[PDB]
Amino acid sequence: HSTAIFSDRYKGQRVLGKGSFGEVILCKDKITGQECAVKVISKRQVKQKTDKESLLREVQLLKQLDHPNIMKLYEFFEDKGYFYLVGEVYTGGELFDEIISRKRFSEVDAARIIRQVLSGITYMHKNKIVHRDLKPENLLLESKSKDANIRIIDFGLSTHFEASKKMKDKIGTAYYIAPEVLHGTYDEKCDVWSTGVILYILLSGCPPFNGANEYDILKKVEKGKYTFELPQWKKVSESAKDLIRKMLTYVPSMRISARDALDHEWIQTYTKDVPSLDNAILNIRQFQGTQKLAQAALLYMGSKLTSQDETKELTAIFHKMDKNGDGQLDRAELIEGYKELMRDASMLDASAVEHEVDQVLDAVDFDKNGYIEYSEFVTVAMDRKTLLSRERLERAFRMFDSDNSGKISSTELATIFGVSDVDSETWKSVLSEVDKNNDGEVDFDEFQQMLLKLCGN
Ligand SMILES: COc1cc2ncnc(Nc3cccc(O)c3)c2cc1OC
Q1: 49 appears as a binding residue in the annotation
Q2: What's the per-residue H, E or C state across 262-278?
Q3: Does the beta carbon of 17 sit less than 6 angstroms from any atom of ligand 1?
Q4: Active site residue 133
Q5: Beta-carbon neighbour count of residue 147 at 10 Å?
């Protein structure tokens, strides 16, 4: 009786993105053609909180649950290096990204969104599963269809896997975390808090607990005080604010349950004219742009560091293989070395690696059937990746620069690096090196230069 192997059943199609605990890859069943989203968790980056037996039983429960606002889990695999969580793929994108693409957004739209989130949470709580890490990135629209349901992803994972301590993994997280989670004694009510934070953001476009860096955010959360004194709260019903107050009640025993929040006047009224919350949409668009650029900045720097690491490793690997030291290896060798290297969730299969080597060889018009100058292969394969990383950062810079100025101001940098939790005198120091003219703004290239200096380059 033999243990099921992930790659015997599924082939990788493409990377969907980064989520909590790992990369998510669009895969396909090699027999049935079923497409799925597979979260690949590396045992080297992510430690388990529970034992094997506890995880296996949770997975077995999760597979049997079914609700229109919860991600479906189909299968689970484990091998020496990874866990694989095989789920249904959702293609409508993140909630907040759909919201900012509309010209209109009212309390009716927010109530219908929150009803869905509370409905999913209610179901999971009845089944004794807690999310703990509910945030906007965990709310995916099922498809691009006008009336697509919201699907909450990652329920139950935080019970089994330890959260990363790396800022590139923590972007966004502090705004939403319940104060009792910080102090250690928590239960399912933490999910109602996080929902309350999200609803506050839907209706005003600003986090209720904010600050200039991650720890300042956490300090505000822990104090637990917030207000509705912003001008844009004047546009909002008293019932919406009453529900928020109940969800952001500090002592969790006193906080409203998810199921009771579904019976709240605000949900009952607004989910059956109502003005558009235009200032809120404006603020959400800004919030989202900033969060996305900070994230892109951190991933860019991570990509540069991974390249410094991998380029020299790949070179030493091939140097060792080149037994007579003439610098030439054949394609089967390049594949074996690239394999020794990956020993990138999308490259955890021999066939995917073969395919990638062929893409690199074709890029440079190296003939695949003879012997190849390996140092040139390494350069090409790494320059491709450096080019890709540069292009992802740029897209995010252009998105943030919504007036098409070509520039990010000093004040905007302060906001971005604060979200990125890059030390203020540190980024200011690097800005003084780059901005020799006291223009107090940077273009894309200059911004990229700052990021390189903030990762030792
Ligand atoms: C299109 O973008 C994404 C689409 C996704 N669709 C479904 N699940 C995801 N994540 C997931 C999949 C399996 C288990 C799990 O806990 C979480 C997704 C992630 C995406 O990007 C990160």
Answers
A1: no
A2: HCCHHHHHHCCCCCCCH
A3: yes
A4: yes
A5: 8
